[PDB]
Amino acid sequence: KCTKNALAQTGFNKDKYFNGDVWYVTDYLDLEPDDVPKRYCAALAAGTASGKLKEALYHYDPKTQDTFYDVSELQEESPGKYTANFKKVEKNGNVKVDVTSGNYYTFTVMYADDSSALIHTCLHKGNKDLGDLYAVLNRNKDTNAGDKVKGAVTAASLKFSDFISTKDNKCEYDNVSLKSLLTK
């Protein structure tokens, strides 16, 4: 089950956030981790296309090399708070799983600047919650969390010590497809 009391950034700048660029998940805190251990890689590209906010998502498992993509049309609930109805797609946009009613995620930009961000996500799949997930994002995949996003982690009453770094997971990203999926 997820918390809805996540606080959106005061004076959050949509323009720089939703610029069509890629954000890398450099650290994360899964509050409801799966039973089986999984090395994780994820990146996303939030922008706009044909009049809408769009977000394209990428997950990768270094170990199995399994990869999946999702692209969603975003609905602003409030500045900094968005609901996303996703569809799983091939890297060229061919739909593998259509948009469906109990399938969607919500996120709250808790902190953001030109280079970094702290988001909270709540994944809902099949009318069921997959639990809270907080992620530290960076425009550069090799950059360590700075003092500002860390103060933001503390400010949300979390411990950065409890966050898992993806820096050593031998991650690989497909930025080209991420960006082109933005219009699919």
Q: Which H or E run contains 177?
A: helix 175-181
The option from ligand HEM, ligand HSM, none interacting with 152 (CB < 5 to 8 A, set by class) reads none
Stretch that binds ligand HEM, among 5-13, 34-42, 144-152, 171-179 (CB under 6 A): 34-42
Q: Helices then strands (H, E): number in the chain?
A: 3, 10
Q: Which amino acid is at 155?
A: A
Residues that constitute the known binding site for heme = 59
Residue 2 touches ligand HEM, criterion: CB under 6 A: no
| Residues 6 or more apart in contact with residue 97 via CB below 8 angstroms | 87, 88, 103
x/- mask, ligand HEM, residues 65-84, rule CB under 6 A, reads -----x--------------
- Residues within window 2-41 making contact with ligand HSM, judged by CB under 6 A: 30, 32
Taking CB under 6 A as the rule, does residue 105 contact ligand HEM? yes
Q: Which two tokens stand for residue 155?
A: 């400010």
Query: Judged by CB under 6 A, which of 24, 86, 111, 134 binds ligand HEM?
Result: 86
| Footprint of ligand HSM on 124-153 (CB under 6 A) | 130-131, 133
Q: Report 65-84 residues binding ligand HSM (CB under 6 A).
A: none
Buried b (16+ CB within 10 A) or exposed e, 80-91: bbbbbebbebeb
Q: Rounded to an integer, what is the distance from CA 180 to the centroid of its chain?
A: 17
Nearer to ligand HSM, 68 or 160 (CB): 68
**CA–CA separation, 120 and 111 (whole Å):** 10
Which is nearer to ligand HSM, 43 or 133 (by Cβ)? Answer: 133
Q: Is 57 in the site for ligand HSM (CB under 6 A)?
A: no
Burial of 158 (0-12, 13-18, 19+ CB in 10 A): middle
Within 8 A by CB and 6+ apart from 35, the residues are none
| Binding region for ligand HSM (CB under 6 A) | 30, 32, 121, 123, 130-131, 133
| Binding region for ligand HEM (CB under 6 A) | 25, 28, 30, 34, 38, 40, 42, 44, 57, 59, 70, 86, 88, 97, 105, 121, 123, 133, 135
